[model samples]
Target: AEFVFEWFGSNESGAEFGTNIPGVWGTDYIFPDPSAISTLIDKGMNFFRVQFMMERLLPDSMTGSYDEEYLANLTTVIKAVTDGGAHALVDPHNYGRYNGEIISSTSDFQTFWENLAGQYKDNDLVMFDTNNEYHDMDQDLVLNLNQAAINGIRAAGATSQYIFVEGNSWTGAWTWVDVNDNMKNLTDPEDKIVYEMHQYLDSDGSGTSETCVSETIGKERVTEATQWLKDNKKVGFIGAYAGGSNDVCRSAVSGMLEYMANNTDVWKGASWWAAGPWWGDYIFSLEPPDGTAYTGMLDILEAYL
Candidate 1:
């Protein structure tokens, strides 16, 4: 189920930074494509993590006001992915804030989930990720808000959709369990909650650079995180993780993949940090810049699959 998609993090002008404004971050942004779903399915991917800009869904992210077109577009994409026999997670690519306001009951976060959950309440394939990589000053701030949104989602009657919650410190997989109390304190009415962790194999583990660390740098940490999940009787999705063409990167990626493949009880599955059209020449892309038939990660993953 290692499904990845070209999730967002936009352009030079930041033009695609905000709402789905239609020539801006607009309706033209990647939506449903049967070919895309079918292609990923063919690639041995059965899930899709569809990311959306916060501004697109909320008229004003800090307050309440849902956009009709944005929601419609998302609905269409979700339906298409599910229609294609692939499960999907509707990810709000926001990093724990909207317009710089920390997510809270006082803010529009709860209402936003209410609307989103209500919209997809009947879709069993849809999972509502509370947010992505929340990194506010207080780690608990993110968890607190997730609980509120979980309550709201349940209140909206989307009781069965898995609620994916990320931890503080960018949900770093190296320190996932120890990273400011990730999801340990949170409970779901549905018992379908899953922790979302992001991993990167570079020195800083930021996923911003091309260089990699020691060939085995990230493997130990991944093993530790896997054990933590089993101990807690919890499950997780590595929502972000990838490597480049360098030997170290490839080696580290291979090590991590092997760990994940062998540990299915705790590691639900993973999605690479990225794959998409916006990432024209972005190095972490599993897709080829020259539009080749395969990527560096494919052989490694295919071996495990």
Candidate 2:
């Protein structure tokens, strides 16, 4: 009878890349490789957050019909993870945008979720993440957009699965209170909304670089945000986080997960920044050759599972 994070794994990223909206499926961007998914599932990592582009899935318009080919590829990836015994977090990796512009209509965003969620309503393993990192936009809009998504998902009968909602400023845990303090107002009829935040140990808290701020910077960054979740009686997910293989980063990764494990009351789980077949030499790629940085981090990640 103890509270504990129920999911842990990595982000299966790839489909969200490329500049061309609704680009050629296999060439511009590709769905996750099924073979790689099974490999991670074999590692005792049962959660896979797969990123997708809103435009690619619904090419005609924001509230338009689905692109059959794109949706088919998406379904293939989702089933690959779910059927493989892992929870599939369907993340529209857009930073609160649709076609390179900040989505200004709440109803459009809501409709988008309603349409997408309806497709997977029967799959209990499918989780819908509202949007990836809302920033430079109206705080109130972001709050409403999140609530609207929850409403939309429930409207589509996706009541059994968790709905992950993100915050502003790239959804960074360090600045959660500063920009998204109002997120506590979001309501869900199913009561399954889980706040999601991304954090990195780099100088700017962005995962773009291989450098880390410090060994304890990971814990330091999320300290206040963890308190916020506890204060509001809400649970959260570290939707994205990563670091290099240096001693500082390895320790930082462990310290961060340890902090979350200690506060299970308000922390549900986490997913490492990424893993995909096409990541090649990307420092954070947890995909095959399992580069030193990623393999080192994976060793630490498997500990929490």
Candidate 3:
């Protein structure tokens, strides 16, 4: 049903880090840990957003050939999640830029998607996220890039998988109305575009701090985005969210889940900011075995699942 958490889990976030574009595998960046993913899959989680830097995967140019080794490594990770009975979302963690500049050519972005999507066209369990957290760029270009991605994905004959689209201003739920009104014009031949937004309960909504603003802040931040989804008859997903490892922050996280559950007509599901081996001691890291507030949030997330 449309009113269900169709996909739910945390990001397996390791492959997108490091400064070396197509760097050494273990030294620069590594694929998500296998046992860690297996554990999460066994823990009632069914979705995994596997983030990958565009440069790592393509390595040449936006319209260039794939880095075969990186592509193979990514495929291995995606297979791990799907083989364990979960959906794998391929997230290009470029933030609307490639190599440090905004993607100036929409056709290049389109071509990139077309090639990438074509490679995974047969995998129904593999989803495509156009880009992640676009900020400080021309608003209209964000819209155009997303539309171009959709066109390219369809052109690659990947009509069955979901295409997750993000907006400007870091793709925050709070600014959805103001920064992404033009996103409503996005068209998909299969009508499977899911508006993906990130929300964090911190004072600035950046999800950088472990401190939350207030107990009701979680629900408050996402309320307008929920209304926007309802008004446009579109469904959305919380691509990332997290808080501190305290009672107050737990309450705020719970409030967000409850709100999303209550408004399932517009809210589809969500993914926690991340879980991976490389993020040792990071505040929002769900890397297991005492990762910050992992246990507290897992208890809350399991109930929803």
Candidate 4:
């Protein structure tokens, strides 16, 4: 398969923006229309990473009933992407069952995957992402959950589809440590598993900075961080960085991309954290409030794409 140009999209449910995270417009609406999909394709995006909420999909807390109407709507979104000549990957951003919750448990996770995989098994363009940023757990727990999720996906009969798995801690670059220690030779016969990681500079949560770039610290960090993945002969890296608009922040992003391009062999492809409204903030916006295109990262990416 050819390399995919990855980009993030909103979730099906409106929880994060509703009351959980607060202060953001939730994605309570259904899939985007054809015109919106056309705009993204025109921007050189080939693959979309859409987030799905299990609670919304299976609202009945007792029965955990799968919402057929929502699933059908999701199917419409997938069709829109394929019809627009793009690939779509489904990422179940499972969050309700956090910190050893039953849903986060192997059996429950398996059930969720089985339900989804059974539904979209025939669509070649639709892929399964185990979960988004499985942080707040120890190394053993993360590995256990991922393996169980993979098993569930396979058991659900989702074969020959691409599967994306991310490290813990908001999918940060440093989380690769647990992955390196725990995951080895864990390949899926039915689906191709790709390792995902995110990066950011001078962000409140990321704890990295633009000065890190000026001091060559940023380059060094990524190089050392990704080295384990490269050495292990793992599938590939997915570079996901976050920062809205700031010269230093932008430099860090561009610097990281340049590094990845030079080392594309280590990464299948890279995607920024998002492409639209998320968390009431616009990290992937072309024109941010801070007036910082950061040297036009999108323009630079377009050249490579």
Candidate 5:
């Protein structure tokens, strides 16, 4: 029950290069067939995270209006997840804006959360992660926005469901500290607040070898970074991390996962950045890049899962 893997569906609208996939991510498109879900379940994934949009479900009368057909398609996938015998979490990846544009006021954020929480509150299998990541904003403001979402969701009667809140700066490492600290103060006793963070390799544009080296200095540094939360007795989870094609990056992810697995009391779980077949050459997907059917990351997950 502890070693869990999370994945995004191909139908997710905000995924990189999603718009290019005609029937999958667009309006009036059907959700991925059963074969897709089967493929993932066969790969040993215990949890599937689906990204949804409030605007798409409830469009504005003027611009970027919501389409009923799209919402129906989304529901189809949700039902499929339940049918697949795997746990599912609904994540609002983007709030009708690219990058990190947040709602201007608390009231607006409340309205957004209320509507979505009310719609999905009955589905116990479907949990909600308020927003993807709050990036480069004042820490106080970020915490306020997250609290607003939590309050609105509870006000809408979504109790006992886990509410995931991501830290600032595109959900990177530093944000985790803020998330763990703030939620402990603002969260309700009944609210299951999980801290979410994203990680990438030094080879990618977002990381440095020093970062890996710092964490790799053994359990002492890991304990230090998480000490405040531990002393306060707070609880949360790590959501995503990047895995590169090369041996260096792969080994780093392997070490990180091994550490997390061995110390479950600190980290909840994590998922690799993606699970898909792309036009570009990459080594993170379950299938091989070439036409030949071969599992790439699945082989790695088998060792740990």
Candidate 6:
């Protein structure tokens, strides 16, 4: 129960489809500054999730060709993250698909990961999330796609990596046990697979509103979710969680940390929902532009640290 780990973190959510908005990176300071990264890492947030898209990196046709501009920008941002001294999760935030198509028995999906993982295999700080949040697709098909991607990472000689596999039903912590009834379907031969799930304590766990449903909303949501993990002896992480300044939200964070601190046997640590440069007006932005004190949401985070 006393399993200690470093996951007090937040996500950088600009790269995925933000390129579609034009000049989301490189042209301007749309990505987090290295100093910003250092400041957060200094606060015990050691795991940073860097979400990007294959569409921008991969062309309409996969001829083993890539877009240099996008890759260059991504390389720059990732270097900023790694150089700042925090582990990063290279997340393809495509919502469980490749270019809007579900992962079937196809080579495109595996090929994408092969190229991406091939670049970061040697770095232990990078964790490859095969798919972000899978849903609607058949569980069997999802498993097959996951296996292919894992094999592709291995085939690329990126063998020693923690590949985080997601489940269906949007990978929501409130409903993970029912949708992903049997995680054994996602077994890997290397024993390096770890479950990646999300939780938001806002109204009905949508994470839409800045206000929380209740003071213990975070713990309320994860109770059944982590219980499922405990019964199955599964290891996982809360890849996305909500943040707010209200007293209720503070209690929400406190409750969940206590839960995980005691039940580390079931679930590992967690990362906050988001903290990115492009999120100028996003309710969940953790860092102010001036690197000043973050919102009250981090009060408990610093305490736990």
101-188 per-residue lDDT for model 2 (tens digits): 9988999999999999999999999999999988889999999999889988999988899999999898999999999999999988
- Candidate 4 regions exceeding 4 Å error are 1-16, 20-34, 61-63, 95-104, 178-180, 203-218, 277-283, 286-296
**Which candidate, 1 or 2, would have the higher lDDT against the true structure?**
2
Candidate 2: residue 185 lDDT (0-100) = 96
lDDT of 3 by residue, 1-305 (tens): 22357788899888988898667888989889878888888877789999999988877788988888889989999999988888999999999999899997999999999999998999889999999999999999999999999999999999999999999989999899988988989999899999999999989887778889999998999999999999999989999888988788999998998899889888889999889889888888887766775765788787756
Clashes in model 1: which pairs?
Answer: 6-275, 20-26, 22-26
Each candidate's lDDT (Cα)? 0.68, 0.88, 0.89, 0.57, 0.55, 0.72
lDDT of 6 at 72: 78
* TM-score for all models, in order of appearance: 0.86, 0.97, 0.97, 0.79, 0.77, 0.90
lDDT of 2 at 79: 96
* lDDT of each residue in 1-305, candidate 1, tens digit only: 23322121111112124343434443346553445446666666666777777766775553566777767867777787778666778788778876556665524577778877898999888888888788754766777778877887888999878888888888888877676455678888779888878888777888877667877866776776788888888888787777776777778877876677677777777776565445446677644323121365566666533
lDDT of 6 by residue, 154-184 (tens): 7787877778887787788888877777765
| Candidate 3 to native Cα RMSD, angstroms | 1.6
Per-candidate alpha-carbon RMSD to the true structure: 4.4, 1.6, 1.6, 4.5, 4.9, 2.7
After superposing candidate 5, which stretches have Cα over 4 Å from the reference?
A: 1-34, 53-55, 61-66, 95-101, 178-180, 203-225, 276-283, 286-294
Better by lDDT, candidate 5 or 4: 4
- TM-score of model number 2: 0.97
| Model 6: residues with Cα > 4 Å off, grouped in runs | 1-3, 17-29, 289-293
Best by lDDT: 3
